[PDB]
Write an enzyme that holds these catalytic residues in place. Structure first.
Site, PDB file in Angstrom:
ATOM      1  N   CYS A 120       0.860  -1.199   0.000  1.00  0.00           N
ATOM      2  CA  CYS A 120       0.000   0.000   0.000  1.00  0.00           C
ATOM      3  C   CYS A 120       0.899   1.254   0.000  1.00  0.00           C
ATOM      4  O   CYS A 120       1.735   1.344  -0.914  1.00  0.00           O
ATOM      5  CB  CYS A 120      -1.083   0.002   1.098  1.00  0.00           C
ATOM      6  SG  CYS A 120      -2.480   1.122   0.564  1.00  0.00           S
ATOM      7  N   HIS A 153      -3.733  -4.683   0.370  1.00  0.00           N
ATOM      8  CA  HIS A 153      -3.438  -5.009   1.761  1.00  0.00           C
ATOM      9  C   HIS A 153      -3.414  -6.494   2.014  1.00  0.00           C
ATOM     10  O   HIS A 153      -4.432  -7.077   2.232  1.00  0.00           O
ATOM     11  CB  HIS A 153      -4.555  -4.417   2.607  1.00  0.00           C
ATOM     12  CG  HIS A 153      -4.398  -2.963   2.853  1.00  0.00           C
ATOM     13  ND1 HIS A 153      -3.820  -2.481   4.006  1.00  0.00           N
ATOM     14  CD2 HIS A 153      -4.752  -1.880   2.114  1.00  0.00           C
ATOM     15  CE1 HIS A 153      -3.890  -1.147   3.995  1.00  0.00           C
ATOM     16  NE2 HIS A 153      -4.443  -0.760   2.849  1.00  0.00           N
ATOM     17  N   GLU A 196      -2.620  -8.128   4.495  1.00  0.00           N
ATOM     18  CA  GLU A 196      -2.723  -8.451   5.909  1.00  0.00           C
ATOM     19  C   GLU A 196      -4.161  -8.310   6.405  1.00  0.00           C
ATOM     20  O   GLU A 196      -4.485  -8.747   7.509  1.00  0.00           O
ATOM     21  CB  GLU A 196      -1.788  -7.520   6.671  1.00  0.00           C
ATOM     22  CG  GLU A 196      -2.292  -6.112   6.940  1.00  0.00           C
ATOM     23  CD  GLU A 196      -2.370  -5.157   5.764  1.00  0.00           C
ATOM     24  OE1 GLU A 196      -2.012  -5.537   4.606  1.00  0.00           O
ATOM     25  OE2 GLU A 196      -2.763  -3.970   6.025  1.00  0.00           O
TER      26      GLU A 196
END
Length: 191
Positions: free
Chosen positions: A79, A166, A168
Site C-alpha cells: 500500500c 493489503h 494483511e
C-alpha cells in the site's frame, strides 16, 4: 528462527504482526532505527505516504533504511510503503524499480476487493484495495507477480517485494508467506 519487522511510525501494524506470527516468524514493531539491526526483513506498511515520509524524516529512518537494503535484507512495501520503496514520476528510497502514482479516487469510491492470480499461489487471493497506489511502469529487472485488469499489483525484485493491496487485511496469509520465504532465503545465504 526469523524475525520480521514492521515499520511502526504510522498506520496500523497489528494485522501485519499477526500475519508474520501466523507464518511462524517473530514479529517486531520497528519504532526506532536501531531496531532494524534486530530483524531479518522489514514490512513497510502505512496508509498515508506523505505523513509516513514526514515521520521517516523526523525519526531519521532514511539512511538506516538504505543501509538495511545494502545488507541484502528483504523489504516489502505494501500500500503506502510501496511508494516509499519505489520511484515516483519522472523522492523516497527508489530501491524497487517501479514508478508509482498515489491514489486519486475520492473517499467514497476509493476501495474494492478483487480476486487475484499471484505467481506462487495456487488458488486466487482476495486483494483488499484501499486508496491503492498505481504502478505505472516496471523496469526490466522486476518480476511481475500479479496483474489485475492490466495493472501490475504485485511485483518482486531480488530482496524487494511490493504490492498495492493489503495482504494483511484477510485471514489468507499466503502473500505474507511469500515474503517470509524471501527472508528465509536471505537468512540461508547470509554470512
Amino acid at each position: 528462527m526469523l524475525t520480521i519487522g514492521v515499520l511502526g511510525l504510522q498506520g496500523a501494524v497489528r494485522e501485519h504482526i499477526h500475519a508474520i506470527e501466523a507464518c511462524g516468524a517473530a514479529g517486531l514493531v520497528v519504532k526506532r532505527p536501531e531496531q532494524l539491526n534486530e530483524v531479518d526483513g522489514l514490512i513497510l506498511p502505512g496508509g498515508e505516504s506523505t505523513t509516513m515520509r514526514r515521520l521517516i524524516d523526523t525519526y531519521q529512518f532514511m539512511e538506516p533504511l538504505r543501509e538495511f537494503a545494502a545488507q541484502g535484507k528483504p523489504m516489502f512495501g505494501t500500500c503506502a510503503g510501496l511508494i516509499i520503496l519505489a520511484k515516483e514520476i519522472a523522492p523516497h528510497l527508489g530501491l524497487l524499480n517501479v514508478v508509482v502514482e498515489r491514489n486519486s479516487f475520492g473517499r467514497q469510491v476509493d476501495s474494492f476487493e478483487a480476486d487475484l492470480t499471484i505467481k506462487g499461489l495456487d488458488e486466487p487471493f482476495t486483494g483488499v484495495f484501499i486508496r491503492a497506489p498505481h504502478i505505472l511502469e516496471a523496469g526490466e529487472n522486476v518480476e511481475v507477480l500479479s496483474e489485475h485488469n492490466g495493472r501490475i499489483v504485485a511485483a518482486k525484485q531480488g530482496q524487494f517485494l511490493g504490492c498495492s493491496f493489503h495482504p494483511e487485511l484477510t485471514e489468507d496469509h499466503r502473500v505474507t508467506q511469500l515474503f517470509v520465504e524471501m527472508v528465509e532465503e536471505y537468512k540461508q545465504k547470509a554470512l
